[PDB]
Swiss-Prot record, chain A:
<dbReference type="GO" id="GO:0002181">
    <property type="term" value="P:cytoplasmic translation"/>
</dbReference>
<protein>
    <recommendedName>
        <fullName>Large ribosomal subunit protein eL27A</fullName>
    </recommendedName>
</protein>
<dbReference type="Pfam" id="PF00467">
    <property type="entry name" value="KOW"/>
</dbReference>
<dbReference type="GO" id="GO:0005634">
    <property type="term" value="C:nucleus"/>
</dbReference>
<dbReference type="InterPro" id="IPR005824">
    <property type="entry name" value="KOW"/>
</dbReference>
UniProtKB/Swiss-Prot annotation, chain B:
<dbReference type="GO" id="GO:0008270">
    <property type="term" value="F:zinc ion binding"/>
</dbReference>
<dbReference type="GO" id="GO:0002181">
    <property type="term" value="P:cytoplasmic translation"/>
</dbReference>
<dbReference type="Pfam" id="PF01780">
    <property type="entry name" value="Ribosomal_L37ae"/>
</dbReference>
<comment type="similarity">
    <text>Belongs to the eukaryotic ribosomal protein eL43 family.</text>
</comment>
<comment type="subunit">
    <text>Component of the large ribosomal subunit (LSU). Mature yeast ribosomes consist of a small (40S) and a large (60S) subunit. The 40S small subunit contains 1 molecule of ribosomal RNA (18S rRNA) and at least 33 different proteins. The large 60S subunit contains 3 rRNA molecules (25S, 5.8S and 5S rRNA) and at least 46 different proteins.</text>
</comment>
Curated annotation (Swiss-Prot), chain C:
<keyword id="KW-0689">Ribosomal protein</keyword>
<dbReference type="InterPro" id="IPR018065">
    <property type="entry name" value="Ribosomal_eL34_CS"/>
</dbReference>
<dbReference type="InterPro" id="IPR008195">
    <property type="entry name" value="Ribosomal_eL34"/>
</dbReference>
<dbReference type="GO" id="GO:0005829">
    <property type="term" value="C:cytosol"/>
</dbReference>
<dbReference type="InterPro" id="IPR038562">
    <property type="entry name" value="Ribosomal_eL34_C_sf"/>
</dbReference>
From Swiss-Prot, chain D:
<protein>
    <recommendedName>
        <fullName>Ribosome biogenesis protein erb1</fullName>
    </recommendedName>
</protein>
<comment type="similarity">
    <text>Belongs to the WD repeat BOP1/ERB1 family.</text>
</comment>
<feature type="repeat" description="WD 6">
    <location>
        <begin position="155"/>
        <end position="185"/>
    </location>
</feature>
<comment type="subunit">
    <text>Component of the NOP7 complex, composed of erb1, ppp1/nop7 and ytm1/SPAC890.04c. The complex is held together by erb1, which interacts with ppp1/nop7 via its N-terminal domain and with ytm1/SPAC890.04c via a high-affinity interaction between the seven-bladed beta-propeller domains of the 2 proteins. The NOP7 complex associates with the 66S pre-ribosome.</text>
</comment>
<feature type="repeat" description="WD 5">
    <location>
        <begin position="100"/>
        <end position="139"/>
    </location>
</feature>
Length: 134, 90, 106, 185, 70
RNA sequence: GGACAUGGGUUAGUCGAUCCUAAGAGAUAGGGAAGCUCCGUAUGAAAGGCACGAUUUUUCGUGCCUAUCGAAAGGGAAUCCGGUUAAUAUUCCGGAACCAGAAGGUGGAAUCAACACGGCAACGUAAAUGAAGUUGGAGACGUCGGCGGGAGCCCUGGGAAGAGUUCUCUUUUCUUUUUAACAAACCACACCCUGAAAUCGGUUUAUCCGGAGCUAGGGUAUGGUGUUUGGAAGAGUUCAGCGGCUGAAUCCGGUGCGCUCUCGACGGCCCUUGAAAAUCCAACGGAAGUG
RNA sequence: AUCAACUUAGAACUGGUACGGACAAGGGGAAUCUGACUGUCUAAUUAAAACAUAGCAUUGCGAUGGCCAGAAAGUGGUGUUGACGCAAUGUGAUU
């Protein structure tokens, strides 16, 4: 039960290795296309750059832009953490069909981006948005 | 039993003397024996060179410093215990 | 029939590596070939890396970028298992230094 | 899967298939089968069970494909908002690549007789193109836009999902996400 | 050293300025081999039908220097 | 006649040298020594760079951290076939390639969500920016012992061309039956996923492996001296005719404790553990940015 | 069912009892002296019982040092060393 919607986890395998993601929906029972206990997540690919009080507003926006990604990941490849992210506006947007039709996948990516942008500006989940160094 | 007494030393044949070959026998069975890895428990530790003991366990791959012929020596074990008791006292 | 070295180097060495061909003129001939390449090895575990060809050092310069690496963090420098250990050990020790700091701050 | 109705049986003609299979089509002149994978379009001859031709679409994702009745032309509708015209005697690369659609392209349909074809996407707009083909080698096929059908609603980020051609005349059957079937005459 | 399975692209490389000559080969097994000398590679095309070969030959631009079997 | 006399003859971006460093030689700094010269090789040396900035009192400020020689058997960019000469050829000729560097141009991709997507994954893709600084890898390594694969040679069953023998016997004896670099597609020990294993099982010529996840089912990677074509039959070879020219044939298969070289997976040995550098690649990091 | 490889056993028959038919290819034993052994040397009269060796033992030295070098030097070796080490010797496996 420690893999719940709203829980921050780390992707340990795949292209996005070491990226912090939020559990968007858990299908631990399995599925026909994914016979294992997978969980769809939304995370960050390009973390926003560090900002300085001396920086002008245009660069502050320029560095604060964040590139998200949505992915279904195996439980064994996810590393759950104690941190939790409040996924407001992000409760119902992901479904098996949303992955089947990429137009819903593209819409989900855009909504995930705008939510991550606003949350970053709000200054919440500082650990979630800082890159993990390894 | 192919050889009743000589053992691994049968390769040396009749040369070098009986006593000068028996001590090699004890040292050589120690040197070529397989030892249980302290980190993975698998019986996969084998001598590489004099003092080097490498574990070929997939996922362990740990190298160790030890005796020339055996992984752990009495002198090293005594030193480890005395240093442990000194540190605990200190 | 018998063959001779094409170059002026006798004394088969590592650089004097040869192959037998039969030509369109029905001739048994040596072909002087180069040494074989090596798959890049992992930096931490030393295992050869997966997804990269086995080429000589300079012959790596002709490849495309994606043909010499793997799309992952440290990809093309560390194996997948090595990277996974890097990630989990990094996160776990970071949580410790946080919990040690919270312990010592009070 | 290939299903033989006369024998009432089913089978898989591929010993090993590379990539996820997105769509399938039958060739109209020579007994070939077209497999539209994630990125590649592969032509397989069924009678000898071998790979005929490979088409490099140069596209991240392929959605649907259609075949000209002459059998030497293929349209690739892609999720990359792109239409790729493949001419089998032209090159392995797409002969033409078109990016008029502003959203992901869903389906492409060729009229079985007339030299007209259409692309339906999720933007709600249907692109009607005239694709003229001569068998003469000197004359490359003429691909030209003809109409931009608009005024179709988009529901849940889903627009024109399926388009079909009339077997005889230039009539278009377009199905939307709202349950509306439009007749473009 | 470059086998071409596409008629058009063989024609286009023939029209391309790098092309210098074309050659015709008539094998005993009755297939026609259209070889096109270019600057860097030699592009050859094998055709199994005589009339397709003939219509291809007349499809070559006149300026190209075509040579029969050597 | 390797004698004697007169002439002729050695063609390279790809083969070597050149480049790299080895053991070692060796100037400079310094110190000795009457001196010839000796010792010395990052040493008791001020031993050289790099970037920012309206231009800074129009007299420059601010930061940032090792010679050389020495290998025609070591390391190492990239060439093959056929032919030609009285004598040269991986060098010339005909054909066919390759590498390194340079510049802009065509086409394609990414981009105002600046720096692509897919796969659970191992990883894949025709592309997919990355300064300084750091780090990893290749170069780059002993020896013996079998075992497996490949190529060439050897052996062999038919076919076809000539030739040998034939008093007798021999559907036979012999020769020939060839395919280069390079380009393209294809081709399963490590690893991933599902799974939970004692009636313990898998497995090798050689007993190693497994709850640190076996067997098994499905994948990923490595991809040549393998295969199918291109090269390429027009060449080479054999044979039958004509006065340089014209006809044919060059085909289809088997085998192995076989030899030569190589390759893969292992095994043993050592108080013996078996070069360096040039060069090349990749990564962490994120300077910077109609065009 | 057909296909492919030479390795052994046994039966007869047969020949001036011949038979690894040429080639190729150990003489063997009972003991003494001596060096343990493999190895090394007087190139061009001495290959040994000599030298070496493992093993044994002794000696010097803890670095401001032992041993060795240089005319001298802000010099060199052991030494990328540290007593399970380096240096100097005598004996010469084992019992």
């Amino acid at each position: 039960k420690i893999l719940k919607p709203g829980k921050v986890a780390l992707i340990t395998r795949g292209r996005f290795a070491g990226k912090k993601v939020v559990i968007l929906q858990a299908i631990d029972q399995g599925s026909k296309s994914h016979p294992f206990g997978h969980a769809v997540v939304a995370g960050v690919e390009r973390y926003p750059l560090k900002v300085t009080k001396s920086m002008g507003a245009k660069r502050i926006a320029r560095r604060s832009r964040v590139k998200p990604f949505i992915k279904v990941v195996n439980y064994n490849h996810l590393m759950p953490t104690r941190y939790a992210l409040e996924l407001d506006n992000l409760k119902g947007l992901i479904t098996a069909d949303t992955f089947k039709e990429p137009t819903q996948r593209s819409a989900a990516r855009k909504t995930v981006k705008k939510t991550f942008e606003e949350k970053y500006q709000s200054g919440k989940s500082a650990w979630f948005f800082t890159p993990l160094r390894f | 039993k192919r050889t009743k007494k000589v053992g691994v030393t049968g390769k040396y044949g009749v040369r070098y003397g009986a006593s000068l070959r028996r001590d090699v026998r004890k040292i050589e069975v120690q040197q070529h024996s397989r030892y249980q890895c302290p980190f993975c428990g698998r019986n996969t530790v084998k001598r590489t060179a004099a003092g080097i003991w490498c574990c070929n366990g997939k996922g362990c791959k740990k190298v160790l410093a030890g005796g020339a012929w055996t992984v752990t020596t009495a002198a090293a074990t005594s030193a480890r215990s005395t240093i442990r008791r000194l540190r605990e006292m200190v | 029939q018998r063959v001779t070295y094409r170059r002026r180097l006798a004394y088969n060495t590592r650089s004097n590596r040869t192959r037998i061909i039969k030509t369109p003129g029905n001739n048994i001939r040596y072909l002087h070939i180069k040494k074989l390449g090596t798959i890049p090895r992992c930096g931490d575990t030393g295992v050869p890396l997966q997804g990269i060809p086995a080429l000589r050092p300079r012959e790596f310069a002709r490849l495309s970028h994606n043909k010499k690496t793997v799309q992952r963090a440290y990809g093309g420098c560390l194996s997948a298992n090595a990277v996974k250990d890097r990630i989990v050990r990094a996160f776990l020790i970071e949580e410790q230094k946080i919990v040690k700091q919270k312990l010592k701050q009070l | 899967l290939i299903h033989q109705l006369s024998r009432g049986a089913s089978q898989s003609p591929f010993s090993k298939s590379k990539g996820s299979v997105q769509a399938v089509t039958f060739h109209p002149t020579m007994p070939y089968l077209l497999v539209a994978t994630q990125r590649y379009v592969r032509i397989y001859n069924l009678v000898k069970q071998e790979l005929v031709k490979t088409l490099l679409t140069g596209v991240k994702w392929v959605s649907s494909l259609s075949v000209h009745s002459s059998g030497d032309h293929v349209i690739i509708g892609s999720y990359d908002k792109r239409l790729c015209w493949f001419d089998l005697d032209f090159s392995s690369k797409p002969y033409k690549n078109l990016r008029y659609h502003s959203r992901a392209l869903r389906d492409v349909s060729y009229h079985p007789s007339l030299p007209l074809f259409c692309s339906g996407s999720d933007d709600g707009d249907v692109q009607v193109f005239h694709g003229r083909v001569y068998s003469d080698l000197l004359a490359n096929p003429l691909i030209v836009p003809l109409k931009i059908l608009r005024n179709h609603k988009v529901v849940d980020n889903v627009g024109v999902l399926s388009t079909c051609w009339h077997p005889k005349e230039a009539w278009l059957f377009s199905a939307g996400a709202g349950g509306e079937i439009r007749m473009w005459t | 050293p470059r086998q071409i399975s596409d008629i058009k692209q063989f024609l286009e490389i023939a029209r391309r300025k790098d092309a210098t000559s074309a050659r015709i080969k008539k094998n005993t097994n009755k297939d026609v081999k259209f070889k096109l000398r270019c600057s860097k590679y030699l592009y050859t095309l094998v055709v199994a039908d005589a009339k397709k070969a003939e219509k291809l030959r007349q499809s070559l631009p006149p300026d190209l220097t075509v040579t029969e079997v050597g």
